[PDB]
Structure formats: structure tokens, C-alpha cells
Amino acid sequence: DPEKVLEQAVIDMQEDLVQLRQAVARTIAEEKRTEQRLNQDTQEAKKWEDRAKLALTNGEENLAREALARKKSLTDTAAAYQTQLAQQRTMSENLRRNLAALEAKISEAKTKKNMLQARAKAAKANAELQQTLGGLGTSSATSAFERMENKVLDMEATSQAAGELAGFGIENQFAQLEASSGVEDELAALKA
Amino acid sequence: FERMENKVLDMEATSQAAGELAGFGIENQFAQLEASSGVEDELAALKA
Numbered sequence: 433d434p435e436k437v438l439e440q441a442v443i444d445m446q447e448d449l450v451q452l453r454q455a456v457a458r459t460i461a462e463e464k465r466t467e468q469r470l471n472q473d474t475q476e477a478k479k480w481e482d483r484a485k486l487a488l489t490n491g492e493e494n495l496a497r498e499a500l501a502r503k504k505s506l507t508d509t510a511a512a513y514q515t516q517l518a519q520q521r522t523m524s525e526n527l528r529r530n531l532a533a534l535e536a537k538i539s540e541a542k543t544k545k546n547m548l549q550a551r552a553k554a555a556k557a558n559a560e561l562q563q564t565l566g567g568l569g570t571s572s573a574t575s576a577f578e579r580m581e582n583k584v585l586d587m588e589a590t591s592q593a594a595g596e597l598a599g600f601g602i603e604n605q606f607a608q609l610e611a612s613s614g615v616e617d618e619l620a621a622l623k624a
Numbered sequence: 625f626e627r628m629e630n631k632v633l634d635m636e637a638t639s640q641a642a643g644e645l646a647g648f649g650i651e652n653q654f655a656q657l658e659a660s661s662g663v664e665d666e667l668a669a670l671k672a
Contacts, residue, residue: 434628545625552632559635562642 438545445538452531462520477506
């Protein structure tokens, strides 16, 4: 059934955009976390170089080169974290583009299905006009007027029976009425 | 969306059935309407 499916697909899209928002936020944490490290880390290199300068000021070359080893170790770690940062920023723009595209895709998928549904529903409504007009009144109502007309024609058949009866051999009874009508006309001839 | 469009196309198939039905031999019933339309136009010719 259509409406169920089309709305369900749209429902799914609402989950998806939230999931990718989480992943974006997660990536923001990765950048924040690496910034926090790299910023401090690069200062730590300085701090141990400063500790080396204390040995320069006077005293222990052993401490001084030991402190270089700290500085080096930190420097190396910062290069690793700089590399990690490139992976974060690349993955971030990957999510960003994926999302922006997905959002447009979702948006139009929903909107097209809705306006399609609307025009499909409107189209079948127009077709249902033509169908209901095709539900013409040219019907068995004619047969009902006909049924009772078949009895009208039975009264006409009763009128054939009335005419079929109507001759009786008693028509001669009119004759003296006509003769006496002549008599009253002779009374008119008497009047003038 | 396709499933419900397959039913849209079934309503279009119902429209092939409506057209496949649509000719009836009763079209001649229009003719006196047209003639009487001409009559009311002759009443316009009477008006001027």
C-alpha cells in the first residue's frame, strides 16, 4: 500500500540525518582533542629545551642531551598527531559533503513523493468524476416506469376487451329517441 | 511509490476501458441542439 511506504521512507531519512549529525559532532571532538594535545605538546618540547638551557647555564651536559631526548620525543609525537589531524580534517569534509548531499537528496525525495502523491490522488479524483458520470441515470428506472406502463397497456388491453364487448344489438333503442327528437322539431315548426 | 503508481497506471487502464466504452452511436443526439443553436442565431439576425 502506497502511503505507508512513502511516509516510511521519509521517516527513515529523519533518522539518518541525526546519525550523520552525531558523526559530525564526533569529528568535532576529534579535532578538538587533537588541538588540545598538539598545542600543549609543542610547548612541552620548549619546556624540556628550557630544562636543557639550565644545564647550559652551568653543569650537566648529560642532563642537557637527556633534555634533548625529551624534546625530540615530543617533536616526533607532534608530527604523528599532525598526521592524525590531516585524517580528521579529510574525514570531516567527507562527512560534511556526504551530509549536505544527503540532505538535499532527502529533501527532494520527500517533496517529490508528496507532490506526486497529491497529483496522483487528484488525478484519480478526476477519473472518479468520469467513472461516477459513467454511473449514468440511463438505468432500470426506465424499467420501473416501463413496468407500470406495461400495466397501462394492460388497461389498453382491457379497453380492447371493452370494445370487443361493446357491440350488443340494442343500438336500435336509439331510433325512437331520434324520431321523438324530430317530433320536438315539429313542435318548433308549430311555434313558427 | 512505484506500487501505488502501478495502480495509477491501472486507473489509466480504467481510462482505456472508459474510452473503449465511450463510443455509443447516440452522438446524433447533438445535431438538433446545433440546429436550434442556429435558430437562436436567426433570432440574433432578427434583433439586427
